[PDB]
């Protein structure tokens, strides 16, 4: 079936259906993946190499984008996001109301993965 359950870095064609590669770095080859191997010319940055045809599925990370990411220095880093949003992403585990913007919420999750895209 699909070689991943979720993908943070899906590179897909704008076609029906999409043709997709998941560029997410892996630390062990997922059971759903046919083969893992290097990426970005880096022998140590391993990915699921499989091309998939079909909807790539959801992101893994707890925020689609973040304008206020705070991350460690590792590659990949561990990051949190202090954006105050109308609704946390479905993939956020712990969402709390904001003190300063009472109609907004904050996701307090920490997540190990590449710096998320900026929202703005």
Curated annotation (Swiss-Prot):
**Residues in sequence repeats:** 1-60, 61-120
CDD domains according to UniProt: BBI
- Which Pfam families is this protein grouped with? Bowman-Birk_leg
Disulfide bond entries: 6-60, 7-22, 12-20, 29-36, 33-48, 65-119, 66-81, 71-79, 88-95, 92-107
The record ties this protein, via InterPro entries, to:
Bowman-Birk_prot_inh, Prot_inh_BBI
Q: Name one GO molecular function term.
A: serine-type endopeptidase inhibitor activity
**Keyword tags:** Calcium, Disulfide bond, Protease inhibitor, Repeat, Serine protease inhibitor
Which residues bear the site annotation Reactive bond? 14-15, 73-74
> What GO CC annotations are associated with the protein?
extracellular region
The protein's job, in short, is: This inhibitor interacts with two molecules of trypsin.
Q: Which family does it belong to?
A: Belongs to the Bowman-Birk serine protease inhibitor family.
This protein's name = Bowman-Birk type trypsin inhibitor
């Amino acid at each position: 079936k699909r070689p991943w359950k979720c993908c943070d870095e899906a590179v897909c064609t704008r076609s029906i259906p999409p043709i997709c590669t998941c560029m997410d770095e892996v630390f062990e080859c997922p059971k759903t993946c046919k083969s893992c191997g290097p990426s970005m010319g880096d022998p140590s940055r391993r990915i699921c190499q499989d091309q998939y045809v079909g909807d790539p599925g959801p992101i893994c990370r707890p925020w689609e984008c973040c304008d206020k990411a705070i991350c460690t220095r590792s590659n990949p880093p561990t990051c949190r996001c202090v954006d105050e949003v109308k609704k946390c992403a479905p993939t956020c585990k712990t969402c709390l109301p904001s003190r300063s913007r009472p109609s907004r919420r904050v996701c307090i999750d920490s997540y190990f993965g590449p710096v998320p895209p900026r929202c703005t």
